[PDB]
Each structure stands twice: as structure tokens, then as C-alpha cells.
């Protein structure tokens, strides 16, 4: 089908633009590539505009998408803002299967896009450690004090495993705590390159 070069995207505040790769694997089958950027609440506002807004990839191709900053510094400058980029691949209609009952699918890749204010203290590679905790016979409230979005994964209460989490900057995110816990926290995060970071042991606050 059609796949994006990244699994996420980081938009550097100030950057005139940011590029993302798109490629069609199907040796023969054209597609219409529509792309847009929804915000955290999934509302298609204008904060970000992608070009080209509409185009075709006849068979194997490999074009570039350009995310354009549209929010004239109208966003939070002390931390990241979460947005969602969607790239939809529209298949052409088969003029042959006209008198037929059909169901045509349309794949869409939806990857996170983080807006990163050009000036931030704590460097990104040094944030997945600032991750503190707080437990209960129920809650295990994650708590990211940094300005970046922590994509917590492989989070285990040591004993029992757990539900992944996306802990917003300087905010928390609760997760159920199914008894089998003890205190041995073991989690891993997904970095700017969509790669897992090293295991780590939960440090309660």
C-alpha cells in the first residue's frame, strides 16, 4: 500500500517547514494522497497545513509532504502541543465493477506531530527519566514534569504488566493498578525517532 517515512513528527518552533516521506509499494495501482493535521481534540483547525493538499502516486513513487506552521506563534511556548497528522490514500474507482456490490477501503496513516517551542531547558534526550510515579490499590498516576510528551510503554507494575500511556507535558495520566504490583516499576518510552529507550525503574515522587 502506501506508507509514511516516520511514525511521528517533530515540528521545531520557528521552522519554516517540515518534510515527511510518502511512498507507494504497489507496483501498479494509482492513489490520491490527501493529508491534514488535526489537533489534540481531533478537530481539523488550521494550525498546520500540508502540501501538496492533494496529489496522485501512480504505482511505486516516493514523494515528499510539507507540513507548514500556520499558528503565528499563537501556541504555548513553554512546552509541546499534541497534534495529529493524517495521510489518506484514496484508490481510484474500478469502472468495470459497476453493476456489482462493492466495498472499497481507504488506508490512512495517523501519526503524532509534536510542536516543539524553539527554546526549552531540559533537553529531550534527558526527559524519559524525569518520569515519577504515585500508586494505590487502584491508581498508578504517571507524572511528566518536563515540557515533552512522554509516550510511556512496556509499563509494568513489576508484577503485572500495564496499559501504555501518553503523559502530557507537565501533566499526569492515570493508569489502573491491578494488585500484582509491589513497587518494581519497569517502563520504556518511544523517542523522537520512534525507537524504544532503555528500561528504567520507577521512581515514586
Amino acid at each position: 500500500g502506501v506508507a509514511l517515512g516516520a511514525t511521528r513528527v517533530i515540528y521545531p518552533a520557528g521552522q519554516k517547514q517540515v518534510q515527511l516521506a510518502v511512498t507507494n509499494n504497489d507496483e501498479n495501482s494509482t492513489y490520491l494522497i490527501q493529508s491534514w493535521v488535526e489537533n489534540a481534540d481531533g478537530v481539523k483547525d488550521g494550525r498546520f497545513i500540508v502540501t501538496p493538499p492533494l496529489f496522485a502516486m501512480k504505482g511505486k513513487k516516493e514523494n515528499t509532504l510539507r507540513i507548514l506552521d500556520a499558528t503565528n506563534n499563537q501556541l504555548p511556548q513553554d512546552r509541546e502541543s499534541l497534534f495529529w497528522m493524517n495521510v489518506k490514500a484514496i484508490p481510484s474507482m474500478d469502472k468495470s465493477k459497476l453493476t456489482e456490490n462493492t466495498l472499497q477501503l481507504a488506508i490512512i496513516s495517523r501519526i503524532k506531530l509534536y510542536y516543539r517551542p524553539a527554546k526549552l531547558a531540559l533537553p529531550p534526550d534527558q526527559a524519559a527519566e524525569k518520569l515519577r510515579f504515585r500508586r494505590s490499590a487502584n491508581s498508578l498516576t504517571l507524572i511528566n514534569p518536563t515540557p515533552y510528551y512522554l509516550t510511556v510503554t512496556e509499563l509494568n507494575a513489576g508484577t503485572r504488566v500495564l496499559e501504555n500511556a501518553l503523559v502530557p507535558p507537565m501533566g499526569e495520566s492515570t493508569v489502573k493498578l491491578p494488585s500484582d504490583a509491589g513497587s518494581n516499576i519497569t517502563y520504556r518510552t518511544i523517542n523522537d525517532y520512534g525507537a524504544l529507550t532503555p528500561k528504567m525503574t520507577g521512581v515514586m515522587e
Binding site: 500500500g1 502506501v2 506508507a3 509514511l4 517515512g5 516516520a6 511514525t7 511521528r8 516521506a21 509499494n25 495501482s29 516516493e62 493524517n86 489518506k88 484508490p91 474507482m93 474500478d94 465493477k97 459497476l98 453493476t99 456489482e100 456490490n101 462493492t102 466495498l103 472499497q104 477501503l105 481507504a106 488506508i107 490512512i108 496513516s109 495517523r110 501519526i111 503524532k112 509516550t151 510503554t153 501504555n164 518511544i190 523517542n191 525517532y193 520512534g194 525507537a195 524504544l196
Partner: protein, 279 residues
């Protein structure tokens, strides 16, 4: 004949070896290129140019660590490229001056589909290149051994997964019928996927997709997708676990479901958007 390193380190006549440290591009995507231009850090000169001519070659070129597992490349030696790792000694270049001129060796490395996250660890041996020297004056044959060490990590961002599927499904199975929809996903690098369907709906339960058609809209029916007997309403993310090198089938079946109370002859065609969510 002698050579010195940009950092100043030298290997006198007779040869020997030295470390050549490099700062490689921090990020390189699959299909993209990693170039280590050594013609910037290795210089050699001819000692008695007026009467002696020097012939310099790329005797061997070996890969190590990251580069050896995460890359496939060529060695461009003086306007010509050859395989890297090298399999044969290259043509000779001449050095005829006491002034340090460059050694035109450059690596063109390309991360593979399977390249990890840190395709090259910082401080690791990236390559060892052997510079050979001879001359038209005597029978001397000396080897200069350059050890290429990477100063930083070379990261190859993980790409999106691939949704293999057989085009436009023929839900022909006359009104009552129901076909299975082939659809799998294979990620070059294991990661957790999540997907949800989107499209216009026709029921309170948001699971029967409206009939979009040109010829006689067989009013009354609609298309509902199920994954192993389980209904998939629109916008209800389904955790696919973690897709890896083995394409997981979503296990979908296009089913006819009724909307209003008056099923009626005609064609039933539908358009559904499947959205894969990345972590």
C-alpha cells in the same frame, strides 16, 4: 610518501596506522545516504616528487559494527565507485608533489529496511581502510591502515508500517452473503498498531455504513465490518497488539446489515476509511 590526519596525526614512510574520527549525520532514513567523506581527513604527499612518482590505491575496505549489519554501500575512489566491503584492490592514483593532497575516498552508506534505531553506536569502529603505496623508483610496498571511528550515534528513524490489501472488494455475495476482507500489516521494525474505521453511518449504533451508489440504490441495507464475529463501529480503535515482520491479518468480513425496514432490490457499494494509529 607520507600521510597525516586532519587532526594532525601522521603515519611516516613505511606505513603504519592511525585513527580517523568522524562526526556522521545524526539522522539517516532508509533509502537515504550516509556519506563519510574521508578526502577531508586524510592527506598524503610525495617526498621526492622531482624524480619519483607515487601510486596510491585502496587496497582493502572493511566494515565493522553498525555499518556492517545496518548498511549496504559503495566506496567511491576517485570518481569511481566499487562495492563496500571491498572485494578487489582499486586502480592506482598518482601523487607527485610534496604538498599534502587529499586521499579521495568516500563511503556511501544506506540504512536498510531492517536498520534498527541506533544503526551506528557512538565511538564504534565503522570501518578500516587500507591505503597502498608503491613507486616507480624502487620495489617498496607499504600499507597505511586507517581506522574509522564514529564520534556519534547514527540514527535511522523507524518508518510507517505497510498495509497490504487486495483492491476493491467484491461484496457481490448477493444481498444476504458476506465475504472476508484480506488485509494485513507488516512493520519493518516491530511496533504497536491500533486502527479504527471512519465513514458515514446510518444507525444509532454507528456500525452500519451507508450505501454509496449510482445505479438503483438498493435501499434498506448497509455494509457492516466484523473482525472474527465482533462488530467494529466507526471510531472505536481496535488494538492490533504489535505488528512485526509477519503481517497480521485484521481478520475482517464485509457483512450486509439492515438499516431501515424495507430492504429493496439494487446495488450496494460502500467506502470505508481504515486509519492505523501509531504509538
Amino acid at each position: 610518501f607520507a600521510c597525516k590526519t586532519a587532526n594532525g596525526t601522521a603515519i611516516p614512510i613505511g606505513g603504519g596506522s592511525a585513527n580517523v574520527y568522524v562526526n556522521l549525520a545524526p539522522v539517516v532514513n532508509v533509502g537515504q545516504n550516509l556519506v563519510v567523506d574521508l578526502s577531508t581527513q586524510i592527506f598524503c604527499h610525495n617526498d621526492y616528487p622531482e624524480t619519483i612518482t607515487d601510486y596510491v590505491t585502496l587496497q582493502r575496505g572493511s566494515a565493522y559494527g553498525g555499518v556492517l549489519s545496518n548498511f549496504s554501500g559503495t566506496v567511491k575512489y576517485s570518481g569511481s565507485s566499487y562495492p563496500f566491503p571491498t572485494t578487489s584492490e582499486t586502480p592506482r592514483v598518482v601523487y607527485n608533489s610534496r604538498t599534502d593532497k587529499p586521499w579521495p575516498v568516500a563511503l556511501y552508506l544506506t540504512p536498510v529496511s531492517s536498520a534498527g534505531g541506533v544503526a551506528i553506536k557512538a565511538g564504534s569502529l565503522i570501518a578500516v581502510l587500507i591505503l597502498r603505496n608503491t613507486n616507480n623508483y624502487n620495489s617498496d610496498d607499504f600499507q597505511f591502515v586507517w581506522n574509522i571511528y564514529a564520534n556519534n550515534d547514527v540514527v535511522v528513524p523507524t518508518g510507517g508500517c505497510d498495509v497490504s490489501a487486495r483492491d476493491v472488494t467484491v461484496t457481490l455475495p448477493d444481498y444476504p452473503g458476506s465475504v472476508p476482507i484480506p488485509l494485513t500489516v507488516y512493520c519493518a521494525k516491530s511496533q504497536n498498531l491500533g486502527y479504527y474505521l471512519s465513514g458515514t453511518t446510518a444507525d444509532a449504533g454507528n456500525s452500519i455504513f451507508t450505501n454509496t451508489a449510482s445505479f438503483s440504490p438498493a435501499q434498506g441495507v448497509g455494509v457492516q465490518l466484523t473482525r472474527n464475529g465482533t462488530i467494529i463501529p466507526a471510531n472505536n480503535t481496535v488494538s492490533l497488539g504489535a505488528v512485526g515482520t509477519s503481517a497480521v491479518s485484521l481478520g475482517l468480513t464485509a457483512n450486509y446489515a439492515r438499516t431501515g425496514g424495507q430492504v429493496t432490490a439494487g446495488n450496494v457499494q460502500s467506502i470505508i476509511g481504515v486509519t492505523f494509529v501509531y504509538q
